[PDB]
Design a protein around this nucleic acid. Sequence first.
DNA 1: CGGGTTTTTGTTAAGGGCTGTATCACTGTGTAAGACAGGCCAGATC
DNA 2: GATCTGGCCTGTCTTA
DNA 3: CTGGATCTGGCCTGTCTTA
DNA 4: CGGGTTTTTGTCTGGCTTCACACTTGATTTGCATCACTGTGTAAGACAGGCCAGATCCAG
DNA 5: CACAGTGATACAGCCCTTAACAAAAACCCG
DNA 6: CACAGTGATGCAAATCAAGTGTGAAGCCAGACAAAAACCCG
Lengths: 510, 155, 77
Amino acid sequence: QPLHALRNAEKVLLPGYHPFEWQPPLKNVSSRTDVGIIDGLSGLASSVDEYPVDTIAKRFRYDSALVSALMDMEEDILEGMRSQDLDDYLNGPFTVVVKESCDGMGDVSEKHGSGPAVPEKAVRFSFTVMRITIEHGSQNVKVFEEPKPNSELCCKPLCLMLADESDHETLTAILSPLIAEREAMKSSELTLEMGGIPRTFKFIFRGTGYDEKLVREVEGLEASGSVYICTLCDTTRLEASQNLVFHSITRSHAENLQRYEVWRSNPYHESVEELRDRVKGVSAKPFIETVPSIDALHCDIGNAAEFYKIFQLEIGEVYKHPNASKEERKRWQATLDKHLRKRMNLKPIMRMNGNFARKLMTQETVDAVCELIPSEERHEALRELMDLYLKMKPVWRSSCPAKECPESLCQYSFNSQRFAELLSTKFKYRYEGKITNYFHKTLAHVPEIIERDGSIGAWASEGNQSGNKLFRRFRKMNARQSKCYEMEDVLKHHWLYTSKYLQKFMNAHN
Amino acid sequence: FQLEIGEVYKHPNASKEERKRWQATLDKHLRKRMNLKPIMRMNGNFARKLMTQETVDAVCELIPSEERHEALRELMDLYLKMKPVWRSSCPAKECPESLCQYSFNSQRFAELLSTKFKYRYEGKITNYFHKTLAHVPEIIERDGSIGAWASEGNQ
Amino acid sequence: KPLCLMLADESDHETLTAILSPLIAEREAMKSSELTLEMGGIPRTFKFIFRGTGYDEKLVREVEGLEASGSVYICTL
DNA sequence: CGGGTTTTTGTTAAGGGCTGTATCACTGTGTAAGACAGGCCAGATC
DNA sequence: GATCTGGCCTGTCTTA
DNA sequence: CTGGATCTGGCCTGTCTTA
DNA sequence: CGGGTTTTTGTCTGGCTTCACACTTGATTTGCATCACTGTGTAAGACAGGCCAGATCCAG
DNA sequence: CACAGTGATACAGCCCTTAACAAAAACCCG
DNA sequence: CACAGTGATGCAAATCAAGTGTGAAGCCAGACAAAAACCCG
Ligand SMILES: [Ca+2]
Ligand SMILES: [Zn+2]
């Protein structure tokens, strides 16, 4: 068909097409059901008499986006209903849970022409459904669940703006309407027509696709180099390097709000350090509610980087020679890089990534590294260390540790305790009084995380990075090259690409 | 342009912060008037858009002098009169007047640089200014067209 | 139309010459011959006159045997 | 070669609807080292 | 034993 | 009244942590 | 809770199409598994420690 | 005078429906 | 336990070709059953 036929058919898939209405009318939200791509600034004034604005933004409306996604998944929901031995005319309360994500991007070049002074950065925000469950009879039964939770074909974009993730003012000014809509939606039901039957929908919002940097910046916490290292418990860097296995999740949103209140009001009238101790390192007002979780991608990246460091320290026998110049460490790093290129076919890189991390964690990699170390017992130490790490990783890296690795799940505490003991005894030269964030996050909190959710790898931020790649591609080859319309085009094209109603036409092999 | 904004013909000495300020002011002006973002290395489209009469008009709003204005106007006029000779795919059938008057225009351009631009072009010159003012008519009469043999296709 | 792809430094003279020697050899060889072939069922005759002009000034200085641009002999013509 | 009769086209008195093309403001490929002239301290020196 | 020389640096200019 | 021992203030400077 | 009055259809009835259906074997054409890799992860902030400077204190 | 794109918008072009006529291409008869 | 690619290669499976006689699923002339969905009775 010609291009105008495509343009006309696009209307059915884009948001703002199907009528819907919540039981108890959303607060501070309009009732217009024909609201599609709108301005992202949300009526922010651009007068010279006020704070300067230098960003642009485009976004949907959140409820309209969810209604469009449900219209898109209607067929999958009906097939799930049929496959579980249920009736299609059931209109019970559907329980939906989604996954949120947000990351900043760099090296986004600015274009010529008129317009505001747009910075050379970008920040994206997206959502992704996870599962749908109806309450039939007494217990529950799941109707649909994403088979590929970390795929780029299921990361629906919501908001796109060319700003800086460190600019707190602009970030809040852009994200506050979405958070308001989310909070208003968290206490309402959605009446929606599927196959000619009004269905009831309820939502459970969970945000886990955030790196630690953004969590610390949003949850009203300090930076990563602070003494409070964990975003789940209240331990400090000192105590975290002495116990390593006995901690409990404590941090939460309401607790952070109360903490900030205590910090601002200062009821007991104490000094700055005593007030920091009382508040446990909270000095800002949170504005996004997130659940305590762990990102698997960045966890693996940090673990591989630290292992890398440990390897290039073991090559130099630092456990006996505490003093060392910079040239010695440079020679050690260069020797390790050349040996990895020779035996592992790996190219030495500067910034740690995922594939390098996946290829580095292997027993034969440890053998190739031990080929560089004269000592004997350090070989055994490194081999046992890597064995423990590789026996622990599938617990949090898999999508269902209760069925894909029950042996490693039920024996996760003993492995973590032995790992901590090995760090304290043999590697004392580096982990005496200090330790990284991920190490604590992995050794202390993840069993509670599985017992609280059931999986960690499914709730990662992989799909977010795949969406960043798709964004880089679309902004360059699937959009008008102009500041006034590039973002709307990219957003619409990505929304069309992420849809499932079109992907079924490509699976015409069964 | 940068040197003319700062009046080098009036103050032969200058610090580095003065240079930085001059460049920033020129970049800011060009961004606000000609709609051109600041770039690190000279581009090709930026070069095409930068070489206009309007650009000189916008730049002259920063030079307080009045003769400098005339100097830059005639400079840009001569350069725009010499451009199509080496940029056209067939100057013998697309711009015969510019081809026949290229020598006179080049001589006037050189005289202008030698008289009113001594502060920069005294006892030194680049490569392409020499190539353009000295060797273009002979290459034209020898091959017939410059620009058709450019290295743009490889780029 | 492409003719050669390599992964080498432009400033690296030894590798550049070692890779480009056969091409220049074949070029200089056939610059004194004529080609015949049958297109449309009729044999034809062809003669070539090659002109290397798509070179920036740095590569011209490199291949022609001159020095960097910062010298005093500035013009290559 | 003509009257008489037939077939297969033109045709604007005005609107509906699908299809093709011009328009607008921009984009990506030109992207690392060498030549040189002036200034300044260690140093052989008459 | 201060006196020019030698050589070493270094910022600028030129092409990318 | 004053020279001089000398005890912190902060300052800049790496190092480690997330990206 | 079932009587009138057209729709909606499978046949009865046997006799005319246009496709359907056994075998080869040597190609010829599709369909699908396999293998070594790819991108998206990409700038600042917290904290300890040596160092003088200058204030803090001592005694003739 | 680099040039192949890049997506939405608008307008011209070319098709389609009531009109009876009216001009172009051909046999039966004379 | 990322994943959808990125191209070539190599092997397994479907098919076609020519050969030809029969075999079988339609449609069709009316027709007067057999429900069967409207009306309400
Ligand atoms: Ca990022
Ligand atoms: Zn913790």
